[PDB]
């Protein structure tokens, strides 16, 4: 009965979703045509002839990145109009994905979201993938989250942001789109998870010994994190943490809901067999201030909640003793209104490896998703990005050109300034 709809929006949303559904089909046994040769109803339905279709709704305004999926090997996997396309892109413009042409794709995407939710008995989360700092993953992502809240009350809407890296961006309007995105990923999102591309670049170099990773290797690390996040939801476990558990043990206030994730048996095939990847070893590497998948050192903040997702042949006494060890560690600082901050979960099914991927077979896993008063430097870093640009009205004549009110930039700035004041006062 348990079931999650994934909604992959944008170029980065689709390309991450290609890695996710590639890993999910290789993990539950579904071939690229749909047939396998009931631990699948969280991500797949059943047509009746042994046929399994993924439960995903792809979105883009370009047709280029989504025509790729319907012409490659995973075309008979998806239902042929799940892959929802437009004609022309918003062109890295938030107002062009919100107040203009992405208003005719929204009524067809919500058409199929309803068709993919009424054929499931009990929905527990709208997993959502976006690329905040762009045109369609920001503009259409903002309008989609507002529309999903008004139509689907409660019904916790997860999100895996692709927030721009602090010191490298590959745009200049990327300060504008991310600050304009805080009016969606703050009051419509519950599970706003912050992922920066630079941090997972550094993970690939320092751990996997890949000095030149491509975006596909970036998405393969993210897909293993989401599989371990839904691991208890699909497989049996000694301690199951479903979505309802997640928004009680990791979110203290409805506004402070921003998390950082760090998987950490992320070991290359050459270096996997020279250490035992024991439970204490993989969680000591999980709390390192370099494996965090946003560029945000937790040592200059204060942890308020941690949700660890030990997965594999992990004995609960080794979970418990490792949590005791990291509690003894002085490098991390838990906030004074938090005697216990260590929601743990155990799933017996070990993490899988894609054949020809960049990871290795590992018996254990840790997915560490935590909230801290260190993410304030992430939003305050693009605070400096915005006010350097908006000081004399850069690139605003092409946001107000298509209908954005001159001034919507300003309360996006006091929306980021509101959460800046909130993170500092929950650490005193």
């Amino acid at each position: 009965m348990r079931e999650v709809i994934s909604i992959h929006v944008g170029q980065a949303g689709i390309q991450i979703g290609n890695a996710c559904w590639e890993l999910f089909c290789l993990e539950h046994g579904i071939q690229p045509d749909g047939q396998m040769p009931d631990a699948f109803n969280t991500f797949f339905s059943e047509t009746g002839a042994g046929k399994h279709v993924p439960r995903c709704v792809f979105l883009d305004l370009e047709p280029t990145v989504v025509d790729e999926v319907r012409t490659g090997t995973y075309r008979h996997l998806f239902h042929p109009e799940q892959l929802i396309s437009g004609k022309e892109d918003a062109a890295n413009n938030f107002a062009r994905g919100h107040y203009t042409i992405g208003k005719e794709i929204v009524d067809l995407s919500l058409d199929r979201i309803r068709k993919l939710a009424d054929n499931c008995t009990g929905l527990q989360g709208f997993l959502m993938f976006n690329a905040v700092g762009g045109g369609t993953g920001s503009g259409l992502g903002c309008l989609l989250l507002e529309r999903l809240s008004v139509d689907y009350g409660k019904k916790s809407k997860l999100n895996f942001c692709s927030w721009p890296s602090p010191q490298v961006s590959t745009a200049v309007v990327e300060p504008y789109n991310s600050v304009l995105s805080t009016h969606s990923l703050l009051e419509h999102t519950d599970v706003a998870v912050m992922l920066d591309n630079e941090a997972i670049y550094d993970i690939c170099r320092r751990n996997l010994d890949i000095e030149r990773p491509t975006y596909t290797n970036l998405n393969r690390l993210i897909a293993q994190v989401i599989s371990s996040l839904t691991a208890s939801l699909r497989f049996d476990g000694a301690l199951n943490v479903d979505v309802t558990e997640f928004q009680t043990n990791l979110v203290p206030y409805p506004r402070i809901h921003f998390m950082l994730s760090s998987y950490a048996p992320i070991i290359s095939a050459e270096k996997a067999y020279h250490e035992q990847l024991s439970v204490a070893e993989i969680t000591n590497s999980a709390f390192e201030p370099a494996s965090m998948m946003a560029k945000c050192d937790p040592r200059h903040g204060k942890y308020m909640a941690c949700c660890l997702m030990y997965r594999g042949d992990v004995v609960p006494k080794d979970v418990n003793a490792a949590v005791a060890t990291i509690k003894t560690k002085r490098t991390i600082q838990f906030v004074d209104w938090c005697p216990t901050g260590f929601k743990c979960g155990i799933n017996y099914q070990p993490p899988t490896v894609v054949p020809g991927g960049d990871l290795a077979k590992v018996m254990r896993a840790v997915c560490m998703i935590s909230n801290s008063t260190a993410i304030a430097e992430v939003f305050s870093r693009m605070d400096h990005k915005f006010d350097l640009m908006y000081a004399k009205r850069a690139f605003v004549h092409w946001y107000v050109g298509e209908g954005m009110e001159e001034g919507e930039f300003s309360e996006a700035r006091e929306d980021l300034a509101a959460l800046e004041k909130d993170y500092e006062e929950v650490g005193i």
């Binding site: 009931d38 631990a39 109803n41 699909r234 497989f235 049996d236 017996y348």
Partner: protein, 49 residues
């Protein structure tokens, strides 16, 4: 009719598939007396010349 012709106890009896595989369960290091079990041991000491 799926029902029994006189008993009203349905005969098809179904077999709904287990949701999870429901495995890796228990079995306990203790064995019916609260003691231990006779698993193979280790030495974890010096080399015993």
């Amino acid at each position: 009719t799926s029902l029994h012709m006189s008993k009203l106890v349905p005969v098809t009896d179904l077999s709904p598939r287990p949701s999870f595989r429901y495995h890796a369960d228990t079995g306990s290091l203790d064995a019916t007396l609260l003691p231990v079990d006779a698993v193979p041991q280790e030495r974890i000491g010096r080399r015993l010349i």
